[PDB]
Amino acid sequence: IPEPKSSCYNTHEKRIYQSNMLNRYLINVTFEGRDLSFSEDGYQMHPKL
Amino acid sequence: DAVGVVAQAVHELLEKENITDPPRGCVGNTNIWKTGPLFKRVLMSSKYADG
Amino acid sequence: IGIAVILVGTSDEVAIKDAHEKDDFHHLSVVPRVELVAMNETDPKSIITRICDLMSDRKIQGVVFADDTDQEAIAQILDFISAQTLTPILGIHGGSSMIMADKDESSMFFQFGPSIEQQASVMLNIMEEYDW
Amino acid sequence: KIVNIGAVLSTRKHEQMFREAVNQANKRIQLQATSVTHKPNAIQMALSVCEDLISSQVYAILVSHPPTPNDHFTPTPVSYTAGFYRIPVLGLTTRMSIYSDKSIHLSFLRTVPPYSHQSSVWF
Ligand SMILES: *[C@@H]1O[C@H](CO)[C@@H](O[C@H]2O[C@H](CO)[C@@H](O)[C@H](O)[C@H]2NC(C)=O)[C@H](O)[C@H]1NC(C)=O
């Protein structure tokens, strides 16, 4: 699991790490019974209106 | 060119000049300055022909 | 990991009472350590100041946030913020989320609300089921 | 009540260019001229634009680009800040089309037509 960035601005001089594929999975997560699969393009799926 | 635009904008700003300030300072004045969009319409409506 | 619920100048001490919940399951949940730092109705500069300071205060590996404001800009501000350290952000109580069309290339941010296509879809369903 | 304005470049002599500008301005109250800097890791760039221009009474800001060929989002970190409170600003160098929308940015006012429009010349 990754680690917190040392700085919001100064870590940039040393921000040398892997490429995070978070959304490749983070979009797709659901628990507590209610399903919350997300969308790639940046919003929800099955929104309650 | 751009400073000529802002020049043409300024002496037209006196026609309304109800801005009373562009809010400065960091904290506290969290409100959209009530003439931002209007002054922007003014500035983008600046007509000169020599730059 | 470090998670916080920042509060921008509201009468929502309901949040102060909120986070007392229970869904402990056999998942990773390695370090769920919530944080509740409210603020006054402040400016984006101080907003980001506290944002990445508190991010750097104890720990941060994922952020949530809500506020009470009109639909103006706070989401866009947070959106840029999301980029500069590769971190997820989930705006909620969408006075802080009137969704934006475009997104930066590699920003892990998301927000709630409907996609405009979905609004079209629902309004068409309404138009449908009453036969005009 | 004299208007104040800040720009970003290394030809800081453009400040004297702004003095000639107010000359030709009153010729065509007064207008003052201010200036700011640039730094990498544009996080603090927002901090700097705040601390250096929101300190005074801004009315419009100027930023060209860095000739460093990154040029992808180098103008953004200020298009947002004064976008809050909606203080208009002026664009100089970059020519991508993203910065044109009225819904994502209320700040850009573009001096150089962006690559999009050049389609019509083919038509
Ligand atoms: C998205 O996640 C779902 C599960 O949340 C994936 O679905 C499949 O695998 C699950 C593993 O337990 C099963 O429970 C699901 O039933 C199964 N889906 C179907 C239709 O049977 C799904 O593959 C994931 N997809 C992507 C693109 O990430």
Q: How was this structure determined?
A: cryo-EM
CB atoms within 10 A of CB C25: 8
Maximal CA-CA distance, chain C: 59
DSSP characters for B14-47?
Answer: TTT-TT-----SSSS--S--TTHHHHHHHHHT--
Token pair 């927002």 in the structure block, residue: D46
- Partners of B39 on chain D (C-beta within 8 Å) are 59, 88
Maximal CA-CA distance, chain A: 45
- Chain D interface disruption, residue of A6, A8, A9, most D CBs within 10 A: A9
Measure the CA–CA gap between A48 and D119, rounded to whole angstroms.
42
Resolution in angstroms, to 1 decimal, for this deposition?
A: 4.1
Q: Are C60 and A4 within 8 A, CB to CB?
A: yes
Q: What's the order of all strands across the beta sheet hosting D4-8?
A: D34-36, D4-8, D58-63, D89-91
Token pair 């043409």 in the structure block, residue: B8
Parallel, antiparallel or unpaired: strands C89-92 and C63-67: parallel
Closest of C103, B48, B44 to residue D110, by C-alpha:
B44
DSSP characters for chain D?
Answer: --BEEEEE-S-TTHHHHHHHHHHHHHH---B--EEE---SSTHHHHHHHIIIIITS-EEEEEE---SSTT-SSTTHHHHTTTTTTT--EEE-S---SGGG-TTT-S---BSS--GGGGHHHH-
The token pair at D114 is: 């962006």
The token pair at C25 is: 């399951």
The token pair at A28 is: 């797709």
